[PDB]
């Protein structure tokens, strides 16, 4: 009984960890995309002026 319950608990914990990792990676992706866009626009702004 303990082995069955422990296996179920560990599976649930792993699913939670997987979704947390997915969310963190998505937020990192958004941040990095914004960084790239700002780098490109800032390069144009510094080359041009203002």
Partner 1 sequence: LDTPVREKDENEFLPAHLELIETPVSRRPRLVAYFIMGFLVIAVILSVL
Task: Give the span between the Cα atoms of 50 and 42, in whole angstroms.
Answer: 10
Burial of residue 45, with CB atoms counted within 10 A of its CB: 0-12 exposed, 13-18 middle, 19 or more buried: exposed
Residues 1-50 that bind a second copy (CB under 8 A): 2-8, 10, 13-14, 17-18, 21-22, 25, 28-29, 32-33, 36, 39-40, 43-44, 46-47
CA 10 to chain centroid: 23
Q: Least separation, in Å, of the C-beta of 31 and ligand 6OU?
A: 9
| Residues of the shown chain interacting with a second copy in the complex, contacts defined by CB under 8 A | 2-8, 10, 13-14, 17-18, 21-22, 25, 28-29, 32-33, 36, 39-40, 43-44, 46-47
């Amino acid at each position: 009984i303990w082995d069955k319950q422990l296996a179920g608990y560990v599976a649930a914990g792993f699913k939670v960890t997987v979704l947390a990792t997915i969310g963190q990676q998505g937020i990192q992706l958004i941040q990095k995309t914004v960084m790239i866009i700002n780098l490109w626009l800032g390069a144009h702004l510094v080359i041009s002026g203002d």
